[PDB]
Amino acid sequence: MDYFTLFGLPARYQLDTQALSLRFQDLQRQYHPDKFASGSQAEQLAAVQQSATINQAWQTLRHPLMRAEYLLSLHGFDLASEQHTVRDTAFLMEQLELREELDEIEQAKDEARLESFIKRVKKMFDTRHQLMVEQLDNETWDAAADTCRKLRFLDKLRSSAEQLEEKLLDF
Incomplete structure (x- = not known):
């Protein structure tokens, strides 16, 4: 259910994809590669992984069908x-x-x-x-x-x- 929590949204089908974009981008900036250009490889990697997570959550919630399928996975369904x-x-x-x-x-x-x-x-x-x-x-x-x-x-x-x-x- 963390995908919803990540964007500070309630676990429901209805949501503001517009507000979702602004928050997705806000989060995305936190993991921009330039912020870790001077860091170790483990750091740069972790940032990539966190970036990946943010994108997986965003893609899942933005897509109408994926969003529903995700919501249902929180209730015992694996579509x-x-x-x-x-x-x-x-x-x-x-x-x-x-x-x-x-x-x-x-x-x-x-x-x-x-x-x-x-x-x-x-x-x-x-x-x-x-x-x-x-x-x-x-x-x-x-x-x-x-x-x-x-x-x-x-x-x-x-x-x-x-x-x-x-x-x-x-x-």
Whole structure:
């Protein structure tokens, strides 16, 4: 939970990324290499390591999904694991249906349908993201973790569709 404490923030999903940046930079200055240029190698190294820690904490807290995954790790969840899969079986089937549709859109080379598909997936990502935030606020950790896993699946679907768009018509 130290990542939050480091930035003097409460362990919650809601936070000011703007205020987070100013504090991250304040901390970062403390470990600027010039401050230890005249020091031993162990000193210069330690500064590098502390700098690394500050950056790991900042990256984790700044990223919406990483921030949620971190918060959940403080409550017995390891979203990094693989043996722990999505419990919402309907969601798995939904993702396969949507992917089969994307393949059809590709075969038809339909730009308008692809644009629509992309926006619809992005909208669902935003809606499920809102649901996760609500679940974290409600402190229903199990539910929040499953939604977080769903968001990871949706993000990949979204990125795959956007990659297709940059090609679609084929020359």
